[PDB]
């Protein structure tokens, strides 16, 4: 708040105007928040383990009045901690202990229990735990669960116009989608017949479900249709007329009452005629006996005398039928109100296609639909249909389902029952008919109000629920036969069944995946990710991939993969949040009257719909009145100019449209969206470097990405640094931030060189120095690819745009040797290689160091036990772990046998299985771990390690206690000196004896007490932490069946940079370093300074990304401000001269949001800042709020450098000039990890597959390249027959020709005696194994 | 067959075959036990079902494998698949003596060769190396030969140059489309893990340097070596089979060089002087006396073969420039000097190669084509062409055109509020006036950008085609196009909303200026649809070629 | 249409590649169809010289030996 302590070290000069009202929230919100609701104690039905329990519980037996209910649940402390869980390889998890209650009701009650045994916390399963950074450790490997996006449950009405039947006419269908349970589909057809289908199953006439709800034809007709009353009064047929019935119809006869003819025959009744009837209140008219020939009678009508049915309900009356129901004494006849435009006569004709009659009939016809071919049964059909949509067990919409359902049905209640009601289905049918009638619209799936966001917590809740249903069958099953007091709620509820539902998700699921950890941006951008397909959903359709108007501020427009799934991923936006109900909402600013108010307001996708939202980029001042009389705004799905005082809200930030990825691209507004996608897409691939650099050109998010992702080490509490080691950092907490008891100091243990998921190096460095004040929320130590708390994914360098003798040809990059000499793009890789000693039927394999047919030079690098020493530098082929496996009676041959007689060698009974270093990769062994089966005797090396780990543990634990004790006694010293101060007196006697001295009556005596209590706890907690650690060490690690022991060697390879490596800027510019050029031949400027990289200018115009050029220019300028300081610092001008110029930099001409110094202390503080600025002056280009040409050229003026951004350069070869200026500057460049010595493979003769003999890599010497169909055509188009035969015969599939060929290649005869490929030879046996006789004819 | 950790794994036929055997065996038994009719019929029906599941599964009940949900794969499913057969179908069998890796440039290569990583070649030619090692007697036996190259003994590298010398390798790229997707090269041993690919071929393959990876195949048998050299060889296919035009056309950097080489400004060093021949023209340029492009008369000797198979000679004073004089040094024999006397863009530079092929034949076109590349890259390098931010020039009248076209839109708006025009008639009107503006601004920055170098020779003024960097790129044909330049300086387009409509408020700014949130957000739909369309239409095209090669 | 005309192929091994394999095999096995190779697709399947290009000389040389004394 006016600048922090690690902010005092380096300040980034920030262009841009718009004040930031809201700051990037926690970027990990979604991932962390979700799992927090799942595992939690919620004193109610809110989603969580509590809620999932209350669903399946209590489980009661069948009538047996033996019930097993659920009390409460708890999470025990984890079995191993995160670090240990990772080393050993098991999952980081907590035991779930749930208190259960077994009640048995007396048989033939009044209900009362003979006995209820309460089983104390029966253990069911171990549910996994989430890291403080939101990853899970499944087996020793960090994993993220991606959030999923699906269609929210409720009711949804779609169209399906066009393609169906090609007659036009559209169609209208309704769909009820519950969170769990069967789907209910309603749909029309070309004849305007309403249909229903359960799941995707057979279509059934809609009315048939209503019958299953116990609705007779009369009440179904009575539900969906209005009543036309026909009166026989005096004689021949009167009728009631609602003056509104005549709209949209042409008069069919003389309509007359009250001695006045309102409408004549053939004149349609428009609003005028209707007005006359309405205002004249004409209730009853006289109608002809011929008008009812088409009108459908409503209820049943029988002849009172013969007691026989004259006409059944839903039958068309005729002029003759009126006679037969008129002479029976009927005054009134009810008919349907049917209008082909407003209220359609659909259901009436739907009944005519209905094969069923009564409820049992419909239930029969439904059950035979779901499970056909087998005879339906009454108890079965009734049970099934009641179990589909109406049972709390097999169906739930939950709250969101019920809420969106009721909300879309235009109801009041926003929360309700989790099942369907007769009212609900009838109401849904009513809504579908209303849309077909022209009133109402269909929703669209792509809108984010119908698109809901899941995440790990919700998924696990569902999975744990599944464990509970499959244990449920068991609980009832046992409670079926149970003896009274013998069994308890333990013998019944199992573990494996419940535990295995959750374990299968995190273990193998499309949503649990290796964290993309090559990179801090990689981590944080993976943890924020969306899916639109995956497991639960549609695993053509381009509509959903495309960008939607609701994506603004919710989903990133430009960060999505370019490929098979485009728009199928997205990423979460910068300020986006999971809605209370699970939608996606974005921040906004409330505009009351004419002022832009700083109250923030979160609007969901549908909430935002009706409001008018101003633009993030708008001009206001003073009181915050919109400067212009009209401002660009967007209201409902579209944007246009809006009046001064109209706007309800305004964008929070200029950023909120994009994502954390896109927000890191400087001058983004200047890059074409295709290359921008590619840019934000490639930035996650930057492998970290040896020297963490820092971006010279930036946005200002780099701090948030570094800190919010856990790669770094952040100060818990402020204080002064007591101790700084490359290992740990110990902070003496300030008293204002400190708790009363135990005092304290925060001991931060730094991560050291270690393997990332992608086999990159993740290593932390201390960024503060001994005894320096640090404030809460300050960066304590940098992580990989972070600088002084900011995010550096690569290293900026001097770049020149110009063709260099074609070495930059396509995207190829020409890099000076200076880059590789400076070791700046170097990368450290950590590979985990393993050696397993298994069990075979011939015998166990030994890890012994005695290996057949290897020299003393081979076995040198191994110890007595057979494992390579720590620190031994190794190369390709070197032996990491000696291993030998039994193979008996080799059965050699005559000439081999003579060979052994001459050279007198005893051929061993053991085969060489030793793990040896992969070919070509060379590094230093930085570690060895040895896991041994529990019960096999630990070997020498393994034993040394155990002792080593034991001693190392003790120093660490004691170290904790040692610093802790001094920190506590140092506080006792201060409290004892107030009120009883003895300065020299107190510190003479042994420190341990201080605790006796009490104090005068005061709270300080109670403070001394506190520190006492916490002291002794620490004394003992240390004891217990040490004991547990020791046991975890000595316990034999559990291994697989058959595995006696496993040795993991950890190699640290340092790869630098070479032709073939991938490099890219933030702007979507790829490249492959082509040649590495001497510093002598590099283009240089008049000053004699070479240039690091020569990029091709030709890549810029075609791909329109101009930011890369601004990024270059400003970069050059930034470097300018640095160089200038480097001169004033190398001149040691003074604090005064430097202070002036630096203030000059931070202002830069007008109207920026930066502010700045001369508050900073002119001596110790000012000089340190300039020293950190001397490399270049760090600059901030906000995303859409970013710098401008004028600001950039002006910074170049302060630079002493031309505005052009171009200089004179000289070819280092001829020493002669270059015609024209070339643009030189500093472009930030990432090294992606595609590095050529991963990708490169070659094979001569490798191993081969058993099923079909074909090249297959078994040594990781990769199987040969795959020759495809298209590649075959290419040989056929050329005339090359023999190249093709040798490709698909001798080189691959021919078990003979390969060997017959190989002997000739060395023999010096190039030929092939191809024979028949084993592929076809197999097809022959396969066809012939069928009843097909396939022979090869003739000769 | 067994696996590690002692578990076993086997084909699904076994689960199937076993059942057919069992039911069959039980049935045999049920006859000797004389079971009732109701049973032997049922056993017979059961036997029928198992035979069906073994043979073709899925035509009755779809039997599921033991303990495993997935229906067990049957004999019909072993032959069958997606599509037709698994054996030859994409894809399509793995093949020995191969490799692959990331590719880089190698402008040094002659058009017939390629950079092959040292290490790739050692493992690739391994049997050849072994036999040659003991053919010359540097290795006692094949085993010792293994140990020598396995040791990478210094003597083996020289033997590898032997096995490499005349021995082509096949290079292949990823979406093999026409037969040119595989071409033979002569390998040149290269330190490093990257494959180097002649730039001129990069076009036929559709191969970038942004990390595309390529595969190598060794032509083992003698018939394959002469096939590789005589059919699939690079130098033997220089022309696309779709149309006889050369596919070896100089690419981007090279054509920007020749464009900068043969070009002329109004006043330049050496203007007006005369030189004996191309030789002293180059002597003038490299020595710093004369500018590369200045109007100059020089004596040249051209040739026309207009005799009957015979080269005529004719010499004259041609009025030309210094650069064109120097470039003439590459052009072989019977081509007239006329071909290099023009400004030499990418289009003319292809027809140069074409005529060279149709007059002097193959061999001269190859060695010529190489030369064009070398010289193209080289002179382009001297030129110092670059792209700065001040290189993209926005028209001075732009703010005025947008403002004038914006009045039109508010006029049609006045007509719609007054009902003078229908909603649709309005919409169409506004779309057009905005449309006219785009053309107006575009052909504005193009006139200013194109000719604006305005210079003085001994007199007052004159104006020529601009020498501005970004313009040279588009005139030459190297990269960029009037459409893309227009997006940089003049306004860019009217984007379109996803449903296919076109927004009636174009993007009035461009990339030299900023695009704001809305302008950028709206651009997003076009980009997003763009990427999908190429990626689906890429796949859609392939399906077509499949159907096509099948019918022929 | 191109796709319709490729359906008919004298060689049944050619049709079994890209068509529905089950149907082709039955329909040929009933008629006892004799595939003479002679096409491209099938010779690749069976693993011999393509009856075009370098191989065109081979097949020719054999085809005349066939149906010949
Ligand atoms: C072994 C593994 O864990 O990889 C995981 C995981 C994606 C990654 O590894 C790693 C964290 C990776 O995210 C980064 C990394 C650098 O990757 C890449 O950048 C490249 C370029 C290589 C991406 C590519 O390959 O093109 C990059 C991320 C950046 C982007 C824009 C991106 O993510 N694009 C992307 C690409 C995909 O294709 C999928 C995908 C998928 C799901 C649910 C996704 O969200 C995907 C996705 O987002 O379902 C499919 C059918 O198959 C799913 C198979 C595997 O899942 C396991 C998970 C468990 O493992 C054991 O059982 C489980 C079961 C599902 O298999 C995959 C899902 C599937 O295609
Ligand atoms: Mg590419």
PDB file of C-alpha atoms in Angstrom, chain B residues 161-232:
ATOM      1  CA  UNK B 161      31.636 -40.975 -45.520  1.00  0.00           C
ATOM      2  CA  UNK B 162      32.321 -43.952 -47.847  1.00  0.00           C
ATOM      3  CA  UNK B 163      29.054 -45.744 -47.270  1.00  0.00           C
ATOM      4  CA  UNK B 164      27.272 -42.356 -47.645  1.00  0.00           C
ATOM      5  CA  UNK B 165      28.953 -40.971 -50.715  1.00  0.00           C
ATOM      6  CA  UNK B 166      26.749 -42.119 -53.531  1.00  0.00           C
ATOM      7  CA  UNK B 167      23.959 -43.502 -51.357  1.00  0.00           C
ATOM      8  CA  UNK B 168      20.693 -41.519 -51.423  1.00  0.00           C
ATOM      9  CA  UNK B 169      18.354 -41.251 -48.499  1.00  0.00           C
ATOM     10  CA  UNK B 170      14.602 -40.684 -48.665  1.00  0.00           C
ATOM     11  CA  UNK B 171      13.172 -37.637 -46.890  1.00  0.00           C
ATOM     12  CA  UNK B 172       9.491 -37.517 -46.101  1.00  0.00           C
ATOM     13  CA  UNK B 173       7.114 -35.010 -44.515  1.00  0.00           C
ATOM     14  CA  UNK B 174       3.904 -35.476 -42.644  1.00  0.00           C
ATOM     15  CA  UNK B 175       0.853 -35.139 -44.730  1.00  0.00           C
ATOM     16  CA  UNK B 176       2.098 -36.930 -47.832  1.00  0.00           C
ATOM     17  CA  UNK B 177      -0.150 -35.608 -50.524  1.00  0.00           C
ATOM     18  CA  UNK B 178       1.410 -35.826 -54.016  1.00  0.00           C
ATOM     19  CA  UNK B 179       4.331 -38.064 -54.910  1.00  0.00           C
ATOM     20  CA  UNK B 180       6.690 -35.242 -54.126  1.00  0.00           C
ATOM     21  CA  UNK B 181       6.016 -35.906 -50.431  1.00  0.00           C
ATOM     22  CA  UNK B 182       8.973 -38.280 -50.631  1.00  0.00           C
ATOM     23  CA  UNK B 183      12.140 -37.182 -52.384  1.00  0.00           C
ATOM     24  CA  UNK B 184      15.643 -38.583 -52.493  1.00  0.00           C
ATOM     25  CA  UNK B 185      18.718 -36.612 -51.557  1.00  0.00           C
ATOM     26  CA  UNK B 186      22.367 -37.298 -51.402  1.00  0.00           C
ATOM     27  CA  UNK B 187      23.289 -37.296 -47.641  1.00  0.00           C
ATOM     28  CA  UNK B 188      25.882 -34.818 -46.336  1.00  0.00           C
ATOM     29  CA  UNK B 189      27.240 -35.607 -42.836  1.00  0.00           C
ATOM     30  CA  UNK B 190      26.314 -32.887 -40.331  1.00  0.00           C
ATOM     31  CA  UNK B 191      27.180 -32.289 -36.698  1.00  0.00           C
ATOM     32  CA  UNK B 192      24.064 -31.826 -34.711  1.00  0.00           C
ATOM     33  CA  UNK B 193      20.725 -33.498 -34.247  1.00  0.00           C
ATOM     34  CA  UNK B 194      18.872 -31.573 -36.967  1.00  0.00           C
ATOM     35  CA  UNK B 195      18.018 -32.611 -40.571  1.00  0.00           C
ATOM     36  CA  UNK B 196      18.902 -29.865 -43.048  1.00  0.00           C
ATOM     37  CA  UNK B 197      16.609 -29.478 -46.031  1.00  0.00           C
ATOM     38  CA  UNK B 198      17.286 -27.561 -49.263  1.00  0.00           C
ATOM     39  CA  UNK B 199      15.087 -24.405 -49.163  1.00  0.00           C
ATOM     40  CA  UNK B 200      13.871 -24.848 -52.785  1.00  0.00           C
ATOM     41  CA  UNK B 201      12.249 -28.141 -51.905  1.00  0.00           C
ATOM     42  CA  UNK B 202      10.600 -26.713 -48.832  1.00  0.00           C
ATOM     43  CA  UNK B 203       7.750 -25.659 -51.109  1.00  0.00           C
ATOM     44  CA  UNK B 204       6.865 -29.032 -52.606  1.00  0.00           C
ATOM     45  CA  UNK B 205       6.739 -30.602 -49.184  1.00  0.00           C
ATOM     46  CA  UNK B 206       4.864 -27.729 -47.637  1.00  0.00           C
ATOM     47  CA  UNK B 207       7.625 -27.794 -44.992  1.00  0.00           C
ATOM     48  CA  UNK B 208       8.148 -24.767 -42.599  1.00  0.00           C
ATOM     49  CA  UNK B 209      10.986 -24.283 -40.186  1.00  0.00           C
ATOM     50  CA  UNK B 210       8.610 -23.711 -37.163  1.00  0.00           C
ATOM     51  CA  UNK B 211       9.465 -27.165 -36.024  1.00  0.00           C
ATOM     52  CA  UNK B 212       8.117 -29.425 -38.668  1.00  0.00           C
ATOM     53  CA  UNK B 213       9.900 -32.873 -38.283  1.00  0.00           C
ATOM     54  CA  UNK B 214      10.770 -35.174 -41.256  1.00  0.00           C
ATOM     55  CA  UNK B 215      11.564 -38.918 -41.647  1.00  0.00           C
ATOM     56  CA  UNK B 216      14.558 -40.582 -43.349  1.00  0.00           C
ATOM     57  CA  UNK B 217      14.549 -44.020 -45.077  1.00  0.00           C
ATOM     58  CA  UNK B 218      17.628 -45.869 -46.446  1.00  0.00           C
ATOM     59  CA  UNK B 219      17.260 -47.418 -49.879  1.00  0.00           C
ATOM     60  CA  UNK B 220      18.833 -50.776 -49.101  1.00  0.00           C
ATOM     61  CA  UNK B 221      18.595 -52.942 -52.206  1.00  0.00           C
ATOM     62  CA  UNK B 222      20.495 -51.925 -55.395  1.00  0.00           C
ATOM     63  CA  UNK B 223      17.277 -51.602 -57.407  1.00  0.00           C
ATOM     64  CA  UNK B 224      16.063 -49.159 -54.741  1.00  0.00           C
ATOM     65  CA  UNK B 225      19.219 -47.035 -54.934  1.00  0.00           C
ATOM     66  CA  UNK B 226      18.887 -46.600 -58.696  1.00  0.00           C
ATOM     67  CA  UNK B 227      15.131 -46.012 -58.221  1.00  0.00           C
ATOM     68  CA  UNK B 228      15.802 -43.418 -55.516  1.00  0.00           C
ATOM     69  CA  UNK B 229      18.422 -41.725 -57.682  1.00  0.00           C
ATOM     70  CA  UNK B 230      16.585 -42.038 -61.004  1.00  0.00           C
ATOM     71  CA  UNK B 231      12.932 -41.489 -59.988  1.00  0.00           C
ATOM     72  CA  UNK B 232      12.343 -40.029 -56.579  1.00  0.00           C
TER      73      UNK B 232
END
